[PDB]
Amino acid sequence: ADYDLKFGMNAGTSSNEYKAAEMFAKEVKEKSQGKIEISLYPSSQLGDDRAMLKQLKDGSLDFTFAESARFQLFYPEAAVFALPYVISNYNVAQKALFDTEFGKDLIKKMDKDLGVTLLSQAYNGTRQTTSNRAINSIADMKGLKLKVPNAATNLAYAKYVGASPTPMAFSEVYLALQTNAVDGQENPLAAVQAQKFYEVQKFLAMTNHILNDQLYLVSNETYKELPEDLQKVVKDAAENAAKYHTKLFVDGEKDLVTFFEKQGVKITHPDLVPFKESMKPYYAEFVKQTGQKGESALKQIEAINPHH
Ligand SMILES: CC(=O)N[C@H]1[C@H]([C@H](O)[C@H](O)CO)O[C@](O)(C(=O)O)C[C@@H]1O
């Protein structure tokens, strides 16, 4: 086709993220009357989110996904998006990004500094903790070899609750869990299902610790080359796909607890009071290390009312 574009993602071909990406690709091809084709490159074939973000800056990849929190890699105060228990729900994540001065400044910085245009935002689940032994209480986290992604906020989650974080790549996790070289991991339910981590974890704790969004991103290199009518086609299709993306996650969080129960998994509901208490020292370190931009991002996020 005239523009042969590529969409890279960490997620696999059974994931919600991929399904929404298929919808995005399909609308774009149609409403562009065939001028744009978007091919999918899942399962981190192109490298992980960090790597793919660098390919979008360079212009060697055209689209990818990223959480708002992943931009803590460049702007330390963007960690606020993933300080555990700080963002209440997805309504708060939406207003954080689009309706605060911090948020709006982060978007403009994404474009001018990092070579990426934010097209849409979806919901990608609330993270929970699976494991090979029960998590009845925060005490059960002691010495747990918990698999985390390569991100400072997830490592901090593990540390401060008394677990032993082993960072690793997503594609590696399943075997690690099965052999028990690690004891647990902490994705939203959707990914626990997509990656089938429920086949090699008898236990799931509802730790509700981090709220993931997902941003549909396009390389500026690619976006600037598209005529404005085709820019609007890609922009609209990204908003349509985001809304669908959010619905897949919302509908699944209802039904998946029962799906895991049927699959022989044992669900616990530990007291979150001490989880939340364990993090105050981390919030203090966060303000200490990120300074006044950081206390100003927290202030703006904590002021957002979580009720629609
Ligand atoms: C857009 C994207 O790639 N998200 C990925 C996130 C982020 O990389 C991480 O949370 C840091 O923000 O990590 C996972 O949860 C993980 O490796 O377990 C998989 C998920 O697909």
Numbering used by the authors: 1 to 308
Quoted from the paper:
Tripartite ATP-independent periplasmic (TRAP) transporters are secondary transporters that have evolved an obligate dependence on a substrate-binding protein (SBP) to confer unidirectional transport. We investigated the significance of this interaction using the sialic acid-specific SBP, SiaP, from the Haemophilus influenzae virulence-related SiaPQM TRAP transporter. The first structure of a TRAP SBP revealed that the charge of the carboxylate group of the ligand, sialic acid, was neutralized by an arginine residue, Arg-147, in SiaP, which sequence analysis had revealed to be the most highly conserved residue, being present in 98% of TRAP SBPs of the common DctP family. Using in vitro, in vivo, and structural methods applied to SiaP, we demonstrate that the coordination of the acidic ligand moiety of sialic acid by the conserved arginine (Arg-147) is essential for the function of the transporter as a high affinity scavenging system.
To understand the structural consequences of removing the Arg-147 from SiaP, we crystallized the R147A and R147K mutants in the presence of 10–15 mm Neu5Ac. Surprisingly, given the very weak binding observed for these proteins in vitro, both structures contain Neu5Ac bound in the substrate binding pocket, and the proteins are clearly in the closed ligand-bound conformation as opposed to the expected open ligand-free conformation that has been observed for SiaP previously. With the relatively conservative substitution of arginine to an also charged lysine, the key guanidinium group of Arg-147 is partially substituted by the Nζ atom of Lys-147, which occupies an equivalent position (0.3 Å shift) to one of the NH2 groups of Arg-147 and provides one of the interactions with the ligand. The other contact is now mediated by a water molecule that provides the missing H-bond to the carboxylate of Neu5Ac. One of these water molecules (water 1) is present in both the R147K and R147A structures, although the other water (water 3) is unique to this structure. The Arg-147 mutations were introduced into the F170W background, and we were able to detect saturable Neu5Ac binding to the F170W/ R147K mutant alone with very low affinity (KD of 38.7 ± 8.3 mm). Rapid uptake of 5 μm [14C]Neu5Ac into these cells was observed for the wild-type siaP allele, whereas no detectable uptake was observed with the R147A allele but a very low level of uptake for the R147K allele was detected (inset). Interestingly, we observed differential growth phenotypes for the Arg-147 mutants, with the more conservative changes in the R147K mutant exhibiting growth more similar to the strain expressing the wild-type SiaP (doubling times of ∼120 min), than the R147A mutation, which resulted in an ∼50% decrease in the growth rate, giving a doubling time of about ∼180 min.
